[PDB]
């Protein structure tokens, strides 16, 4: 269960709809943050529960953020930010054997796809029921951040 | 070392004018991307030229693009794209221990910037200097960036 957190000043979502002749246009936005974090969540092929939680409990409570003399002491609640959890299966694309990426260890569509909902439903539970923005799983999307710091962060719940 | 790859479609690197001639405060632009790689790079203390030697290739050869009824088809150097590497020490913030991050793990401010100097140049030699840009090395950067897709892959030259 692997993820990319980028701490951010901003972030904006959109994807396309349909009906567009020119050379990809047509973009639609359905989907912001301000001051924040924003996430890529890949789900593996035998993820379980305890490992959807470990991405929220981080994503939730790492102190990111320097206040006032001390650095590294704020979390996103503390600040009250908001969060953009976004599915991502590229991080499972195995590229060990070649210039073509091998996605086979990721977790198959419909399978990942309710998973995903689930966690993007827990990740309120633990926070504040509006802090939280999705993408739209299966879509091409766009995505202008605002990249503070910069400051990125990687976890595989696996290595532990 | 780690790197994290993102595709975009542009990407705008900014710094703070630490300006106390003439004014105060203000960020101003010093690098500048289209379409193309973003690339958060992390020194590690134990990395060998190998290492780097192989994110410069992963990194300029994958294919992460979509040619002609083609998926996976097209790697930065084909259709002529750029990158724009950015050193990133927190990508070693170790994570299990407590909520604040150490990186206790990640190689040192100026043993690192030269190593990074190292990449960067052979970046601009395995491909072309002009596609290939950077930032400010240790400093407060605004990085807007235009993820196209999103498509993020991770290598972990450790594995």
Redesign the interface.
Known sequence: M?V?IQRV?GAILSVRKENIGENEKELEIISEIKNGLIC?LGIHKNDTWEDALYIIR?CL????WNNDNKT??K?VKDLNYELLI?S?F??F?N??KG???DFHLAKEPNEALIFYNKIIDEFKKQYNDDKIKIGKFGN????????????????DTH??
């Open positions: 692997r990319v000043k890529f981080k409570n790492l102190r990111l590294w002491d979390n976004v991502q590229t991080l694309g590229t060990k210039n073509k990426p091409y999307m766009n995505i202008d951040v605002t990249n503070d710091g910069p400051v990125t962060i990687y976890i290595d532990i």
